[PDB]
């Protein structure tokens, strides 16, 4: 059945996965893909306590909650926040934050935008005496909310290779004499942070690893689908079609099956819109000829001639990876929080590159079944 | 070919998967099966901690920690032991990180590795209790083994042997200093006990993290193996015999058994056996005794027998260990064949041992794909028959 595919999508869809993953397949000289990828078998004393406390966490969430807490005790200030450098499969970085004092919700900040954006992208701290005199600052929010931002201390969090993995930020030094952020404030703050980077890195490596295995589990489940019943294309291609629309979050899928007997044609065709069933034209063509996936961000901007806005189109090769059994077409990657259409990325290629392998084997065994099938109603 | 398998095998050490792993599969709600789940020291201590903290590599981390404990207290030799646990859940310490007499050794790691059972020897027993030991004379210790001393002319006097714990207070290794350096012939301080321990408390956290990370890697590599095997056996589903040879070759290879036997249930008479396929590990690849098979088909549960002779349910170089498993069809309601492994082996020493949980986990997940494959191959053979009938 599908129903195996009911709460497939309750656990996941390919967008929890949109970060840099290890390559999902490795190819050799003569083009056997394998899945075996990456060969893989007092000041000081108060700081020691804090380190001891964070180091046990490989859950990024819990480790950020703890890092938030700590920074409160560390320099004295009105409002604190913590930012976490994220990154998707295209290697596009941004900042994220659910841990900010307002004094549920989730700030997202693009790479070089802002004070924090900037200290992020530059790996350099900002101690700002008076915000209203930094070009980089901007008082919209102060004014709207009636808060006034005097002093800022905004520090990069770095891992051991000294890459920025998030950012932390104190606003408005608590002070009698009316004071700015100290030099000792800067030092104490960076000292803590230099550890958070190393721990944060590790927690990120861990989760990436968990995510890489969750991927395998998805493929393994999808195999058990596909391979369930291999006695007719119309069935199987629907299963393939059905799943992919749901995991990949696209608007339509089309599978094209090369002619058994010529070698240049399209003996058959399937198509699903992203709700249900009606089954039974150029883009395939190119792929088949090229023997290579096709990602067009916008259709109307290429070397075809022109809704169908974003396209990814994948060759279904055969047992030996040689001929091209068939071809696979997805249109309009949506960002489906929204329904907003959107280009395909490496993540999307990787996953499909992978499912196509079983698709391959599924289809080419169905065909051999249907070829007996059809040597028997020639008795007809 | 199954050249592929040789190539996988070299990239894979059986030995490494011999530790507690999560199951490859999983039931949810009525049992539907599924892969998808759900002051100036304080200053120097920080520098050391900063340094170990970047290492999710257990090897490198151990190397770094060893090096570090030299600088900790003044003692003649040191060693570092690591708690391990295997698929059966038996624990034991090991060390390739042991100080020796200066100019004596081959390489340091000269291929060579102490290994103590869980609650045995000085370090064994510290592990098991989780309390440090500060002895002034090893020779007074009932658990001291003096052979090493005797064999090598070394004289061990004082030992500081201290458990390394993770944050949940589990022991993940043990570190010891032998023979306090001394211009006046001294023991190990209360103070000594306490610098050593400060540092070890971080070590246990980092190591525990590194262990966790290497488990996920191994959990992932297992699945990679499985995806590749699915590919193999789904490649050509037209000859039962083709696909069986593959299934068996595969098992014998990745599971290190002496014999594998697939019993296919007769399709019409659903309680004899149409065909039988047997491969022995010596490689040879061919097509009498049915009782384990019959049980499983009638039971429908895996059957795991640590030693066929010492076993009571079954009227009885031979046949020691048996793992043996139903193969089920697409809908998991019916049993189309059985898979029987004989004589799990220790990785070549060759010694025979029983199947553990890691073997059931793997076989359990493999035969899901075995079934799908065998059932779709029977289909193809069916129509092939159903066309030699008419034509």
Curated annotation (Swiss-Prot), chain B:
Notes on the domains: Composed of a C-terminal catalytic domain containing two putative divalent metal sites and an N-terminal regulatory domain which contains two homologous allosteric cGMP-binding regions, A and B.
Phosphoserine found at: 13
Q: In which tissues is it expressed?
A: Expressed in aortic smooth muscle cells, heart, placenta, skeletal muscle and pancreas and, to a much lesser extent, in brain, liver and lung.
Which function does this protein serve? Plays a role in signal transduction by regulating the intracellular concentration of cyclic nucleotides. This phosphodiesterase catalyzes the specific hydrolysis of cGMP to 5'-GMP. Specifically regulates nitric-oxide-generated cGMP.
* UniProt similarity note: Belongs to the cyclic nucleotide phosphodiesterase family.
Q: Which organism is it from?
A: Homo sapiens (Human)
Domain named GAF is located at 57-207, 239-374
Q: Under what name is this protein listed?
A: cGMP-specific 3',5'-cyclic phosphodiesterase
Entry comment on modification after translation: Phosphorylation is regulated by binding of cGMP to the two allosteric sites. Phosphorylation by PRKG1 leads to its activation.
Full-protein residues shown: 98 to 518 of 875
